[PDB]
C-alpha cells in the first residue's frame with residue numbers, strides 16, 4: 001500500500017481545531033476544520049491516507065540570521081513531514097526552500113483592534129504612540145515587516161523588533177487576547193480578521209489590506225506530491241468545492 005503521509009499542521013481556527021466530543025478521540029479524529037476537509041478531498045483525489053501531527057514548536061516558520069528555519073517550514077526542509085496543510089502563506093523566501101502547491105485561498109495583512117479609536121490605517125497606527133502593535137512571532141506577517149522597504153512598515157518593524165518580548169506574540173490566540181485586554185493592535189491575515197470579527201463584536205478590522213498573497217500546501221523541495229496536489233487543488237477550485245468549504249467554516253455574519 002501507499003506509504004501513510006505525514007502531515008504537519010498547526011492549531012488555527014477555523015482551519016484546524018480540536019473536535020468537541022464527550023467520548024475519546026484518537027489520531028486524526030481529534031481534529032476538524034477547513035484544512036481537515038481539504039485533506040479529505042485531496043487524499044481522495046490522490047489516493048493516500050495520512051497522519052496529522054501538530055508542529056512541535058507551534059510555529060509557521062521563519063529563518064534566523066544564520067539562515068536556519070523553524071516551524072512547519074523546517075519540518076518540510078528536514079523531511080519530517082510529507083505535506084504541510086495549514087493556512088501557510090506562499091512567500092518568496094519560503095518558495096526558495098520548500099515547494100508550494102498553487103494557492104487554495106487568497107488574503108492580505110490587515111489590522112485587528114478594538115472599536116472606538118480614530119486609527120484608520122497602518123500609517124495612523126505607526127504614527128500614534130498610545131496603542132502598541134505587533135504580529136505572531138515567526139510567521140509571514142512578521143517577515144513581511146522585517147523585509148519591507150516601505151518607510152511606514154520599516155518603522156513598524158523597528159518598533160515591533162524593539163519591543164519583541166511583548167509585541168511579537170506566540171500565536172494568534174495570544175494576539176487576540178492582547179487586543180481584547182490591553183492597548184494593542186494585531187497585524188493579522190484578513191481571512192482570520194473576517195472570522196473573528198463576525199464572532200466577537202468588540203473586535204474590528206482597521207484599514208484595508210496591506211498586501212495580497214495566497215495560502216498553499218507545502219512540500220519538501222523536489223517532492224513528487226507537489227504537482228499532484230496542485231492539480232487536485234485546481235480541480236477543487238474549478239468544481240466550486242474550495243468556495244463551499246470556505247462558506248461551511250466561516251458561516252455566518254454575527255455582528256453589526
Ligand SMILES: N[C@@H](C[C@]1(C(=O)O)C[C@H]2OCCC[C@H]2O1)C(=O)O
Nearest residue numbers: 060087088089136139140141172192
Ligand atoms: N499564515 C502565516 C501565519 C500567520 C501570520 O503570520 O499572519 C499567523 C496566524 O495568525 C492568524 C491568521 C493565520 C496565521 O497567519 C504564515 O504562513 O506564516
